[PDB]
């Protein structure tokens, strides 16, 4: 649907074509993250930092339990049946999170039945059996640190130093927590919170959590980097200082009739000046409908882009006409950086601005000249096979489009400036012009 | 040039003038990073975590080698006589590539000649068991190896190989490797779609060595006096030139460039100051930093660049175009300058330039010291220049300052200028203004 | 593309086919030659010859440094990351320069970056008292000093410093230095109008070291198995990059290229054989060596090239054009080939290609051993092909030869060709002929 | 880039066209020309091949 031939006139050359995939169909796993480390092996010289740590952790955790109890006390069976009068303010995401919370409360009761076992764990990853058929893992936030460094060093150094090191390590852990579990956690019910952020309750080591949970998919890395693996807090205990998390493991579902087209910008020559076109690098096409994408939130691979939400955003109608052949509506920016790309390779066919970079292919042994009317030059085996641009000697393929490419001209768009201060003044000047 | 006098009355008080310099002429040094520790001394109960770490690592390094081999299987030396020296590129087999990708490809082949020598040392590279090791590829050429978690294992795991049940040692080693992989996945994971590129900073590369780039750069050498500069501006970059899936180690070519001052170019910083107009406070909306090069004025996207006391440093020519209206606003035509009403009570209201201070004498208490009488600002003067002509010591709130001569017009405070139109700079305000003007046009 | 059958019938029998290679991709090594010897151990009664030699050497070396300074003063590093950031040329201060001269100028500046470091070693270079010395340039780099007259002094004058009158040692010395200068003037004298260029062979440079280039190249290293080649073809060249008039020592950058065989490019040699026609002997005038590359036929000025057994080696692409008529002659239009009547009795009359024998049996007596009878050439056959079909063993005077089978036409000896016009190739014959045609035209 | 057409044999590069030229690895600053101002806009006849 895109006119790539006319887009190469404006410096937009064809890049990779990728398949668009979205998170869907999430499974569930239940884990126990214990933020209080078992310190029964170091009780001889643990001092009084433990009570201060407990008070600080209670102060941190209590608002979480408060914002969970609004849904705990307002949900009962009457499927899941909600009480909106005592909720007051909630979004669609919040209500779905609450229904998920009550669905997970059934297994939360069974995990809470093992409170004594949970509070007695003294290893980083401990296996507990919540039912005869299903099991649960327990992760202690700082148990590896204690058992590896602080337990062996209980007698070689005076235990005042041990106490200070304990306090500093717990304070560093709290420092790492507070970016995520502190007052920034305004809405704990929501499940949009990434596993990477949840692992800050375990030292940022989400690899251990996921590997112990036993991932069994070939999309695991794309799931992890695209923030697809999400979690939700369903119970917080202020007596044993532990939270249980439902980790969601989804599957990457490729969207039918959907692909993502990448365009590589090439500086082109116009009116004895060098310009660059202002068109988005990536385009979402779904059932012959063209729309943008905030690909910064997504993860780009060699053949696909993985997103944990549907990120299609609207496109201006004029932009849509620009990408479908009407190149006169594609905005262009004057070039000020001496380090803007000037040549690009698509399908083995080389598009370049020979006015700005000298082109002289080797097989003819002569220079390739660009006139004052041509924005970019196509080189292929038809003109001369192997081209040289500065330090590179490149062997080329054959073009598939028109054979008279270099002889046909086109129309060009208007100049624009993309800086935020530039945008305000163009609005101001246009407003003044209207007046 | 810039008209500081007309800018000052709008509130754009003159600031520090900084030179502009960009990386150039990069030197090349080669190193290897072994993404796997040598667990030889702890192998007695290393368990099975080594094998699983091998598979997980391989799952990350395989795409990198796959992307590199798109070039390796498509790169060779030509006759060199049919045409001036260069490297041949099998472009029909490459398909999709940018200028930067092809440039990295050329550098990749060029480094391959040294990489063959380093690979001749594969057994020595695998045998490394120190966090930093020095090796010879020939008697007139050293190379360095930086292991993954060798030092950490060497310092805490090996000494505690008996004092605790070493099954706990297996657990701790598993946690350490997982922590490394989690730290690595931000850079070397699926985000690394283009290993054929030299735009990756040494800070990102050091994540394969625990984020410890200072050891990389100290061991390689502080060749220049601007070293901190090249470091902070993301100027020191590196490229992966060899990936090994059996010893689990990469070869990286680190670039140490030199900062070239762009001649006849400087960066001017403008300070905003709130000023009066129509019984309200306003702050002008102009770029804080302007790049003037060869008597041509243009913006600079200075977010990536590093600002020091004396010069502005960028790892790329980050100059960007500037509107014609901003040009005229910056060279005298203050009626085209934007201004924004200030609602916040935490906007700066006075600034000091060249020993003279431009102040907003009504919005802040404004009195003088040497006479004890207050300094009054009328409703028609946007800002009051206070210099030692009016009195040599002024008081603003709780600060008492001594002021020097002025260099411009002597009758500055008695001359007014025209004022531009208001603007609003919120993200949603732009859409609202566009809609209103579109509806007005219709 | 060459049709060998008509060429053979005219008298141009097949010869060896050799590949075409050219010097390419030159590596560099830097050395210094001290053109003055250290006479410290024998300075007790050297006399005043040292000072006079000093003045003479200054007089010879001054123009070299004067020509070098034209580039030294006018070479500078252009500023900023816009261009490759290399060297700028004060072209208006240079005035007159060629492409090769400018190229050498660039290589001269490039080498300055190392020459400054070597000139830091000035005191060490003065202190050298052996004909070859190795010095550390850096912890990863080295440089060699060659003394022009150290071997002679250390082997003859120092041992014989007392067994003969000292005055006699004075003369001997004077004579030795004068001999050095006489050998030197051919290369480093006023003949060296352009010291900047790098087209000067290592053999010529070694004249400053007594003509012993094999020591220069052995001490630097036999980098490849083609060494004798880059040596004879004048492919190994050097450049003078710094001349010092106080210590009288020059720095030379020696270039060690690699021989790139040109693809689709071979050199063909044709053997001339005298052939009978019109009751007289004639020899065709065609190039002995012909260069056919990319199906294109061109001559080669092989006098400056080296013709080994398997390849033709040149320090420069010495391909030259060829007349259209010569191309048609070598293609098959055999009537366009010139021929020269032979009056010498020492012209070869037979040749052997692929084991088949071409001979002029009219001029030389041929008989076959197997049948014990003469081999007869008629008056209208230019040459006689003899092979195993004719008879497996023929003789030509005092040689018994055994012949293989022919690969071309079976009826070779029964088919005739057309013959071209006579020519005369004396230097005065060209002037005589040109007058005749000019008079004929008038 | 400085472009040469198929009609003209060589180019006079001087400060008039621009004051510094690049020809591969050389960067050369140039001086004034003393002959005709319109050097590059006029063609001449050419001799026979030999």
Coordinates of N, CA, C and O in Angstrom, one line a residue, chain B residues 69-197:
Chain B
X69 N 27.6 -12.2 11.2 CA 27.9 -13.1 10.1 C 27.2 -12.6 8.8 O 27.7 -12.9 7.7
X70 N 26.1 -11.8 8.9 CA 25.6 -11.2 7.7 C 26.7 -10.3 7.0 O 26.7 -10.3 5.8
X71 N 27.6 -9.8 7.8 CA 28.8 -9.1 7.2 C 29.9 -10.1 6.9 O 30.5 -10.0 5.8
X72 N 30.3 -10.9 7.9 CA 31.5 -11.8 7.7 C 31.3 -12.7 6.5 O 32.3 -12.8 5.7
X73 N 30.1 -13.2 6.2 CA 29.9 -14.0 5.0 C 29.8 -13.1 3.8 O 29.6 -13.7 2.7
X74 N 29.8 -11.8 4.0 CA 29.6 -10.9 2.8 C 30.8 -9.8 2.8 O 30.5 -8.7 2.3
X75 N 31.9 -10.1 3.3 CA 33.0 -9.1 3.3 C 34.4 -9.8 2.9 O 34.7 -10.9 3.4
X76 N 35.1 -9.1 2.0 CA 36.4 -9.7 1.6 C 37.3 -8.5 1.0 O 36.7 -7.5 0.6
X77 N 38.6 -8.8 0.8 CA 39.5 -7.7 0.2 C 39.3 -7.9 -1.3 O 39.3 -9.0 -1.8
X78 N 39.2 -6.8 -2.0 CA 39.1 -6.8 -3.5 C 40.5 -6.9 -4.1 O 41.5 -7.1 -3.3
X79 N 40.7 -6.8 -5.4 CA 42.1 -6.8 -6.0 C 42.8 -5.6 -5.5 O 44.1 -5.7 -5.3
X80 N 42.1 -4.5 -5.2 CA 42.8 -3.2 -4.7 C 43.5 -2.5 -5.9 O 44.0 -1.4 -5.6
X81 N 43.5 -3.1 -7.1 CA 44.1 -2.4 -8.2 C 43.0 -1.9 -9.2 O 43.2 -0.8 -9.7
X82 N 42.0 -2.7 -9.4 CA 40.8 -2.3 -10.3 C 40.4 -0.9 -9.8 O 40.0 -0.1 -10.7
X83 N 40.5 -0.6 -8.5 CA 40.1 0.7 -8.0 C 41.0 1.0 -6.7 O 41.5 0.0 -6.1
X84 N 41.1 2.2 -6.3 CA 41.8 2.6 -5.1 C 41.5 1.7 -3.9 O 40.3 1.2 -3.9
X85 N 42.4 1.4 -3.1 CA 42.2 0.5 -1.9 C 40.8 0.6 -1.2 O 40.4 1.8 -1.1
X86 N 40.2 -0.5 -0.8 CA 39.0 -0.5 0.0 C 38.6 -2.0 0.4 O 39.4 -2.9 0.1
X87 N 37.4 -2.1 1.0 CA 37.0 -3.5 1.3 C 35.7 -3.8 0.4 O 34.9 -2.9 0.4
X88 N 35.6 -5.0 -0.2 CA 34.5 -5.3 -1.1 C 33.3 -5.7 -0.2 O 33.5 -6.2 0.9
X89 N 32.1 -5.4 -0.7 CA 30.8 -5.7 0.1 C 29.8 -6.5 -0.8 O 29.5 -5.9 -1.9
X90 N 29.5 -7.7 -0.4 CA 28.5 -8.4 -1.2 C 27.1 -7.9 -1.0 O 26.2 -8.5 -0.3
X91 N 26.8 -6.7 -1.5 CA 25.6 -5.9 -1.2 C 24.3 -6.6 -1.6 O 23.3 -6.4 -0.9
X92 N 24.3 -7.5 -2.6 CA 23.1 -8.2 -2.9 C 22.7 -9.2 -1.8 O 21.5 -9.4 -1.6
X93 N 23.6 -9.7 -1.1 CA 23.4 -10.6 0.1 C 23.2 -9.9 1.4 O 22.5 -10.4 2.3
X94 N 23.6 -8.6 1.5 CA 23.3 -7.7 2.7 C 21.8 -7.3 2.6 O 21.1 -7.4 3.6
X95 N 21.3 -6.7 1.5 CA 20.0 -6.3 1.3 C 19.7 -4.9 1.9 O 19.6 -3.9 1.2
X96 N 19.5 -4.9 3.2 CA 19.1 -3.7 4.0 C 20.3 -3.3 4.8 O 20.7 -4.0 5.7
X97 N 20.7 -2.0 4.6 CA 21.8 -1.5 5.4 C 21.8 0.0 5.2 O 21.6 0.6 4.2
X98 N 22.1 0.7 6.3 CA 22.3 2.2 6.3 C 23.7 2.5 6.1 O 24.6 1.7 5.9
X99 N 24.0 3.9 6.0 CA 25.4 4.3 5.8 C 26.2 4.0 7.1 O 27.3 3.5 7.0
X100 N 25.6 4.1 8.3 CA 26.3 3.8 9.5 C 26.6 2.3 9.6 O 27.7 1.9 10.0
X101 N 25.6 1.5 9.1 CA 25.8 0.0 9.1 C 27.0 -0.4 8.2 O 27.8 -1.2 8.6
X102 N 27.0 0.2 7.0 CA 28.1 -0.1 6.1 C 29.4 0.4 6.6 O 30.4 -0.4 6.4
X103 N 29.4 1.5 7.2 CA 30.7 2.1 7.8 C 31.2 1.1 8.8 O 32.4 0.7 8.8
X104 N 30.3 0.7 9.8 CA 30.7 -0.3 10.8 C 31.2 -1.5 10.1 O 32.2 -2.1 10.6
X105 N 30.5 -2.0 9.1 CA 31.0 -3.2 8.3 C 32.4 -3.0 7.8 O 33.2 -3.9 8.1
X106 N 32.7 -1.9 7.2 CA 34.1 -1.6 6.8 C 35.0 -1.7 8.0 O 36.0 -2.4 7.9
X107 N 34.7 -1.0 9.1 CA 35.6 -1.1 10.2 C 35.7 -2.5 10.8 O 36.8 -2.9 11.3
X108 N 34.6 -3.2 10.7 CA 34.5 -4.6 11.1 C 35.5 -5.5 10.3 O 36.3 -6.2 10.9
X109 N 35.5 -5.4 9.0 CA 36.5 -6.2 8.2 C 37.9 -5.7 8.5 O 38.8 -6.5 8.8
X110 N 38.1 -4.3 8.5 CA 39.4 -3.8 8.8 C 40.0 -4.3 10.1 O 41.1 -4.7 10.2
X111 N 39.1 -4.5 11.2 CA 39.6 -5.0 12.4 C 39.7 -6.5 12.4 O 40.3 -7.1 13.3
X112 N 39.1 -7.2 11.4 CA 39.1 -8.7 11.3 C 40.6 -9.1 11.2 O 40.9 -10.2 11.7
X113 N 41.4 -8.4 10.5 CA 42.8 -8.7 10.3 C 43.6 -8.8 11.7 O 44.4 -9.7 11.9
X114 N 43.3 -7.9 12.6 CA 43.8 -8.0 14.0 C 43.0 -9.1 14.8 O 43.6 -9.8 15.6
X115 N 41.7 -9.3 14.5 CA 40.9 -10.2 15.2 C 41.3 -11.7 14.9 O 41.3 -12.5 15.8
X116 N 41.9 -11.9 13.7 CA 42.4 -13.2 13.4 C 43.6 -13.5 14.3 O 43.7 -14.6 14.9
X117 N 44.4 -12.5 14.6 CA 45.6 -12.6 15.5 C 45.1 -12.9 16.9 O 45.6 -13.9 17.5
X118 N 44.1 -12.2 17.3 CA 43.5 -12.4 18.7 C 42.9 -13.8 18.8 O 43.2 -14.5 19.8
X119 N 42.2 -14.2 17.8 CA 41.6 -15.6 17.8 C 42.7 -16.7 17.7 O 42.4 -17.8 18.2
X120 N 43.9 -16.4 17.2 CA 45.0 -17.4 17.3 C 45.3 -17.7 18.8 O 45.9 -18.7 19.0
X121 N 44.9 -16.8 19.7 CA 45.1 -16.9 21.1 C 43.9 -17.5 21.9 O 43.8 -17.3 23.1
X122 N 43.0 -18.2 21.2 CA 41.7 -18.6 21.8 C 42.0 -19.4 23.1 O 41.3 -19.2 24.1
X123 N 42.9 -20.4 23.1 CA 43.2 -21.2 24.2 C 43.7 -20.3 25.4 O 43.3 -20.6 26.6
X124 N 44.5 -19.3 25.1 CA 45.0 -18.4 26.2 C 43.9 -17.6 26.8 O 43.7 -17.5 28.0
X125 N 43.0 -17.1 25.9 CA 41.8 -16.3 26.3 C 40.9 -17.1 27.2 O 40.5 -16.7 28.2
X126 N 40.6 -18.4 26.8 CA 39.8 -19.2 27.7 C 40.5 -19.5 29.0 O 39.8 -19.7 30.0
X127 N 41.8 -19.6 29.1 CA 42.5 -19.9 30.3 C 42.6 -18.7 31.3 O 43.1 -19.0 32.4
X128 N 42.2 -17.5 30.9 CA 42.2 -16.4 31.8 C 41.4 -16.7 33.0 O 40.3 -17.2 33.0
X129 N 41.9 -16.3 34.2 CA 41.2 -16.4 35.5 C 41.4 -15.2 36.4 O 41.2 -15.3 37.6
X130 N 41.8 -14.1 35.8 CA 41.8 -12.8 36.5 C 40.8 -11.8 35.9 O 40.5 -11.9 34.7
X131 N 40.3 -10.9 36.6 CA 39.3 -9.9 36.1 C 39.9 -9.1 35.0 O 39.2 -8.8 34.0
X132 N 41.2 -8.7 35.1 CA 41.9 -8.1 34.0 C 43.2 -8.9 33.8 O 44.0 -9.2 34.7
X133 N 43.5 -9.2 32.5 CA 44.7 -9.9 32.1 C 45.3 -9.3 30.8 O 44.6 -8.9 29.9
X134 N 46.6 -9.2 30.8 CA 47.4 -8.6 29.7 C 48.1 -9.8 28.9 O 48.7 -10.7 29.5
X135 N 47.9 -9.8 27.6 CA 48.4 -10.8 26.7 C 49.1 -10.2 25.4 O 48.9 -9.0 25.1
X136 N 49.9 -11.0 24.7 CA 50.6 -10.6 23.5 C 49.9 -11.2 22.3 O 49.8 -12.5 22.2
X137 N 49.5 -10.5 21.3 CA 49.2 -11.1 19.9 C 50.5 -11.1 19.1 O 50.6 -11.9 18.2
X138 N 51.4 -10.2 19.4 CA 52.8 -10.3 18.9 C 53.7 -9.4 19.8 O 53.2 -8.7 20.6
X139 N 55.0 -9.6 19.8 CA 56.0 -8.9 20.7 C 55.8 -7.3 20.7 O 56.2 -6.7 21.7
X140 N 55.4 -6.8 19.6 CA 55.1 -5.3 19.4 C 53.6 -5.0 19.5 O 53.1 -4.0 19.0
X141 N 52.7 -5.9 20.0 CA 51.3 -5.7 20.2 C 50.7 -6.5 21.3 O 50.4 -7.7 21.1
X142 N 50.4 -5.9 22.4 CA 49.5 -6.3 23.5 C 48.0 -6.4 23.1 O 47.6 -5.6 22.3
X143 N 47.3 -7.1 23.9 CA 45.8 -7.2 23.9 C 45.4 -7.5 25.4 O 46.1 -8.1 26.1
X144 N 44.2 -7.0 25.8 CA 43.7 -7.2 27.2 C 42.4 -8.1 27.2 O 41.5 -7.9 26.3
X145 N 42.3 -8.9 28.2 CA 41.1 -9.8 28.5 C 40.5 -9.3 29.8 O 41.1 -9.2 30.8
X146 N 39.2 -9.1 29.7 CA 38.4 -8.7 30.9 C 37.4 -9.8 31.2 O 36.3 -9.8 30.5
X147 N 37.6 -10.7 32.2 CA 36.6 -11.8 32.5 C 35.3 -11.3 33.0 O 35.2 -10.1 33.3
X148 N 34.3 -12.1 33.1 CA 33.0 -11.7 33.5 C 32.9 -11.5 35.1 O 33.0 -10.4 35.5
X149 N 32.8 -12.6 35.8 CA 32.7 -12.5 37.3 C 33.9 -13.2 38.0 O 33.8 -13.7 39.1
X150 N 35.1 -13.2 37.3 CA 36.3 -13.9 37.8 C 36.6 -13.2 39.2 O 36.7 -14.0 40.2
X151 N 36.8 -11.9 39.2 CA 37.2 -11.2 40.5 C 36.2 -11.6 41.6 O 36.7 -11.9 42.7
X152 N 34.9 -11.4 41.3 CA 33.9 -11.6 42.4 C 34.0 -13.1 42.9 O 34.1 -13.3 44.2
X153 N 34.1 -14.0 42.0 CA 34.3 -15.5 42.4 C 35.6 -15.6 43.2 O 35.7 -16.2 44.2
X154 N 36.7 -15.0 42.6 CA 38.0 -15.0 43.2 C 38.0 -14.4 44.6 O 38.9 -14.8 45.4
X155 N 37.1 -13.5 44.9 CA 37.2 -12.8 46.2 C 36.3 -13.3 47.3 O 36.7 -13.3 48.5
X156 N 35.1 -13.8 47.0 CA 34.2 -14.2 48.0 C 33.7 -15.6 47.9 O 33.5 -16.3 48.9
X157 N 33.5 -16.1 46.7 CA 33.1 -17.5 46.5 C 34.2 -18.5 46.8 O 33.9 -19.4 47.6
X158 N 35.3 -18.4 46.2 CA 36.4 -19.3 46.4 C 36.9 -19.3 47.9 O 37.1 -20.4 48.5
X159 N 37.1 -18.2 48.6 CA 37.5 -18.2 50.0 C 36.4 -18.9 50.9 O 36.8 -19.6 51.8
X160 N 35.1 -18.8 50.5 CA 34.1 -19.4 51.3 C 33.6 -20.8 50.7 O 32.5 -21.1 50.8
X161 N 34.6 -21.5 50.1 CA 34.2 -22.8 49.4 C 34.0 -23.9 50.4 O 33.4 -24.9 50.1
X162 N 34.4 -23.7 51.7 CA 34.2 -24.8 52.7 C 33.5 -24.3 53.9 O 32.7 -25.1 54.5
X163 N 33.6 -23.0 54.3 CA 33.1 -22.5 55.6 C 31.5 -22.6 55.6 O 30.9 -22.6 56.7
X164 N 30.9 -22.7 54.4 CA 29.5 -22.9 54.3 C 29.2 -24.2 53.5 O 30.1 -24.6 52.7
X165 N 28.0 -24.8 53.7 CA 27.7 -25.9 52.8 C 27.6 -25.5 51.3 O 26.9 -24.6 51.0
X166 N 28.5 -26.1 50.5 CA 28.7 -25.6 49.2 C 27.6 -25.8 48.2 O 27.6 -25.3 47.1
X167 N 26.5 -26.4 48.7 CA 25.2 -26.3 48.0 C 24.7 -24.9 48.0 O 24.2 -24.4 47.0
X168 N 24.9 -24.3 49.2 CA 24.6 -22.8 49.2 C 25.5 -22.0 48.3 O 25.1 -21.0 47.8
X169 N 26.7 -22.5 48.1 CA 27.6 -21.9 47.2 C 27.1 -22.0 45.8 O 27.2 -21.1 45.0
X170 N 26.5 -23.2 45.4 CA 25.9 -23.4 44.1 C 24.7 -22.4 44.0 O 24.6 -21.8 42.9
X171 N 23.9 -22.3 45.0 CA 22.8 -21.3 44.9 C 23.3 -19.9 44.7 O 22.7 -19.1 43.9
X172 N 24.3 -19.5 45.5 CA 24.8 -18.1 45.3 C 25.4 -17.9 44.0 O 25.3 -16.8 43.4
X173 N 26.1 -18.9 43.4 CA 26.7 -18.7 42.1 C 25.6 -18.6 41.1 O 25.7 -17.8 40.1
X174 N 24.5 -19.4 41.2 CA 23.4 -19.2 40.3 C 22.8 -17.8 40.4 O 22.5 -17.2 39.4
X175 N 22.6 -17.3 41.6 CA 22.1 -16.0 41.8 C 23.0 -14.9 41.1 O 22.5 -14.0 40.5
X176 N 24.3 -15.1 41.3 CA 25.2 -14.1 40.7 C 25.2 -14.1 39.2 O 25.2 -13.1 38.6
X177 N 25.1 -15.3 38.6 CA 25.1 -15.4 37.2 C 23.7 -14.8 36.7 O 23.7 -14.1 35.7
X178 N 22.6 -15.1 37.4 CA 21.4 -14.5 37.0 C 21.4 -13.0 37.1 O 20.8 -12.3 36.3
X179 N 22.0 -12.5 38.1 CA 22.2 -11.0 38.3 C 23.0 -10.4 37.1 O 22.6 -9.4 36.6
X180 N 24.1 -11.1 36.8 CA 24.8 -10.6 35.6 C 23.9 -10.6 34.4 O 23.9 -9.6 33.6
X181 N 23.1 -11.7 34.1 CA 22.3 -11.7 32.9 C 21.3 -10.7 32.9 O 21.0 -10.1 31.9
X182 N 20.6 -10.4 34.1 CA 19.6 -9.4 34.2 C 20.2 -8.0 33.9 O 19.6 -7.2 33.2
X183 N 21.4 -7.7 34.4 CA 22.1 -6.5 34.1 C 22.5 -6.4 32.6 O 22.4 -5.3 32.1
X184 N 22.8 -7.5 32.0 CA 23.3 -7.6 30.7 C 22.1 -7.3 29.7 O 22.3 -6.7 28.7
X185 N 20.9 -7.9 30.0 CA 19.9 -7.9 29.0 C 19.4 -6.5 28.6 O 18.8 -6.4 27.6
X186 N 19.7 -5.5 29.4 CA 19.4 -4.1 28.9 C 20.2 -3.7 27.7 O 19.7 -2.9 26.9
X187 N 21.4 -4.2 27.5 CA 22.3 -3.8 26.5 C 22.5 -4.9 25.4 O 22.3 -4.7 24.2
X188 N 22.9 -6.1 25.9 CA 23.3 -7.2 25.0 C 22.1 -8.1 24.7 O 22.2 -9.1 24.0
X189 N 20.9 -7.8 25.3 CA 19.7 -8.7 25.1 C 19.1 -8.3 23.7 O 19.8 -7.9 22.8
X190 N 17.8 -8.6 23.6 CA 17.1 -8.3 22.3 C 17.1 -6.9 21.9 O 16.7 -6.6 20.8
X191 N 17.5 -5.9 22.8 CA 17.6 -4.5 22.4 C 18.7 -4.3 21.4 O 18.7 -3.4 20.6
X192 N 19.7 -5.2 21.4 CA 20.9 -5.1 20.5 C 20.5 -5.7 19.2 O 20.9 -6.9 18.8
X193 N 19.8 -5.0 18.4 CA 19.4 -5.4 17.1 C 20.4 -5.2 16.0 O 20.4 -5.8 14.9
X194 N 21.4 -4.3 16.3 CA 22.4 -3.9 15.3 C 23.8 -3.9 15.9 O 24.4 -2.9 16.1
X195 N 24.4 -5.1 16.2 CA 25.8 -5.2 16.6 C 26.8 -4.6 15.7 O 27.9 -4.3 16.1
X196 N 26.4 -4.4 14.4 CA 27.3 -3.8 13.4 C 27.0 -2.3 13.5 O 26.3 -1.7 12.7
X197 N 27.7 -1.7 14.5 CA 27.5 -0.2 14.7 C 28.6 0.2 15.7 O 28.9 -0.6 16.7

